[PDB]
Design a protein around this ligand. Sequence first.
Ligand SMILES: CC(C)CN(C[C@@H](O)[C@H](Cc1ccccc1)NC(=O)c1cccc(O)c1)S(=O)(=O)c1ccc(-c2ccno2)s1
Lengths: 99, 99
Amino acid sequence: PQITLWKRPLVTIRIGGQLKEALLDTGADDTVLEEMNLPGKWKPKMIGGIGGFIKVRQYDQIPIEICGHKAIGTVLVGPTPVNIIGRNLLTQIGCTLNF
Amino acid sequence: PQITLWKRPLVTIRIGGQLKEALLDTGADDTVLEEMNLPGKWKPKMIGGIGGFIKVRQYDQIPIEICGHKAIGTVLVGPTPVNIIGRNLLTQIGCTLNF
Ligand SMILES: CC(C)CN(C[C@@H](O)[C@H](Cc1ccccc1)NC(=O)c1cccc(O)c1)S(=O)(=O)c1ccc(-c2ccno2)s1
């Protein structure tokens, strides 16, 4: 599909039994999801953007479905105001910028 | 061009006769540049990112050439971690997400 940018590029994602709306975000190196209690090992991390840093939990090899496309990779979980699909998963679903 | 996302989508912009590197950022509503001088009137604004809120200077109707494509619009200047081109100008240059 082609997504124009007149509005926020929000799409439906699935992570286990949770469907959420997430931003397709070319400015994000990694995927950052709102607080959720995912199973498995994780590592603490700090990520920075406008306003400073937040503390997140890094989970690896988490499967996520994005508009029916399969992805699997690192997901950072923490107190972000919006679910963010970053480049680590955008590449896996075939996402490019075009102009 | 078509830009893939295995690397950060950094491009050269021209603003006020200056060349800068900026990140094409579909998760940003606004275009936010690091501290710089721009002429004309501006007004104080606050914007929010992943880490909280910051104060910026809002300049309207500023020309920027983004990878050879002309835009004229609102540019915010303040303590962003990196120069970011947001949707307000991505739309002007006809940028879409595709997968
Ligand atoms: C700043 C950028 C370099 C990294 N961030 C991604 C941005 O697209 C961000 C997304 C956003 C939207 C709405 C609320 C909060 C955030 N947008 C914005 O900050 C934003 C949103 C709306 C208006 C505005 O003027 C700015 S980011 O959110 O700070 C970020 C995401 C992943 C990061 C990472 C670092 C290491 N591994 O992964 S850093």
